Amino acid sequence: HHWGYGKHNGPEHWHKDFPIAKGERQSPVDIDTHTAKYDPSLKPLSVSYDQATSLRILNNGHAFNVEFDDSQDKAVLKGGPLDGTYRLIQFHFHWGSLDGQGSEHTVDKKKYAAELHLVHWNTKYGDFGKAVQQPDGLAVLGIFLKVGSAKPGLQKVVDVLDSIKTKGKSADFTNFDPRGLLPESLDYWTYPGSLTTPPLLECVTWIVLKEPISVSSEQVLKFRKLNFNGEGEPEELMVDNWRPAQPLKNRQIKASFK
Ligand SMILES: NS(=O)(=O)c1ccc(NC(=O)Nc2cccc([N+](=O)[O-])c2)cc1
Numbered sequence: 001h002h003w004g005y006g007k008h009n010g011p012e013h014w015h016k017d018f019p020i021a022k023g024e025r026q027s028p029v030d031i032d033t034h035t036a037k038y039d040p041s042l043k044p045l046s047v048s049y050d051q052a053t054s055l056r057i058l059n060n061g062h063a064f065n066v067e068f069d070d071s072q073d074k075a076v077l078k079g080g081p082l083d084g085t086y087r088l089i090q091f092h093f094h095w096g097s098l099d100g101q102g103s104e105h106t107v108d109k110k111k112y113a114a115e116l117h118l119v120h121w122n123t124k125y126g127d128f129g130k131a132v133q134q135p136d137g138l139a140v141l142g143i144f145l146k147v148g149s150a151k152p153g154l155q156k157v158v159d160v161l162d163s164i165k166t167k168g169k170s171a172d173f174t175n176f177d178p179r180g181l182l183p184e185s186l187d188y189w190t191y192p193g194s195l196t197t198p199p200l201l202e203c204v205t206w207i208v209l210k211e212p213i214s215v216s217s218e219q220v221l222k223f224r225k226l227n228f229n230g231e232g233e234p235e236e237l238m239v240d241n242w243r244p245a246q247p248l249k250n251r252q253i254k255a256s257f258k
């Protein structure tokens with residue numbers, strides 16, 4: 001509630017409340033494409049979202065989350081580097097004030113305009129709160145966004161943002177199909193990392209897709225009209241809610257493709 005993305009509470013301050021900010025497996029990272037190792041034993045990713053049940057969209061003061069019913073195996077991620085079944089609980093984005101920045105992961109130091117995170121937790125741990133305490137508790141599928149053509153599957157999200165302008169606002173958001181947010185290819189890089197916001201827990205297997213999706217200038221402009229603040233507090237536009245790349249330290253990024 002103290003932390004954020006401003007000059008006085010931004011990523012460079014987080015370590016004072018959350019010392020794991022300087023830990024051994026922090027995210028995001030830069031993905032050096034020439035140094036990533038193809039790993040022929042990585043299985044294809046299995047994204048099974050056909051029974052997904054979205055419930056609600058919420059402005060939480062740092063981003064907006066579209067939440068799903070995760071009380072049964074309705075939308076799950078399996079395969080790739082993962083063992084077992086991971087259930088979709090929410091997705092959200094990080095984005096910039098300018099098209100030239102906004103993603104958390106970078107690719108050969110390149111920043112994308114935004115980055116989508118589809119967050120899943122390992123069902124062997126029973127619930128999300130237990131999963132985040134485990135080194136293999138979460139799998140987050142990260143997808144880069146660049147500005148170009150509109151993404152039709154994103155539009156329903158863009159159109160509800162006026163109803164959740166400020167922190168703490170939520171709206172019903174049922175029957176949304178997250179398959180409309182995926183690129184054509186599921187080729188990916190993978191490495192062990194962390195949540196990219198406090199509490200920065202080191203519980204995530206990151207799976208970052210090689211192929212970005214394109215969204216229109218009008219779509220990302222609507223992201224930038226959201227507010228970090230609550231209604232009746234001074235207006236601060238919700239932009240640049242991304243953490244910069246952290247040191248790779250003792251990790252190797254693996255690639256599913258060559
Ligand atoms: N930026 S990220 O590393 O992908 C990230 C992913 C997940 C979280 N945390 C949550 O999803 N927390 C949470 C906790 C309770 C309930 C729900 N939810 O219903 O969406 C979500 C923080 C950062």
Ligand SMILES: [Zn+2]
Pocket residue numbers: 092093094117196
């Ligand atoms: Zn995120």
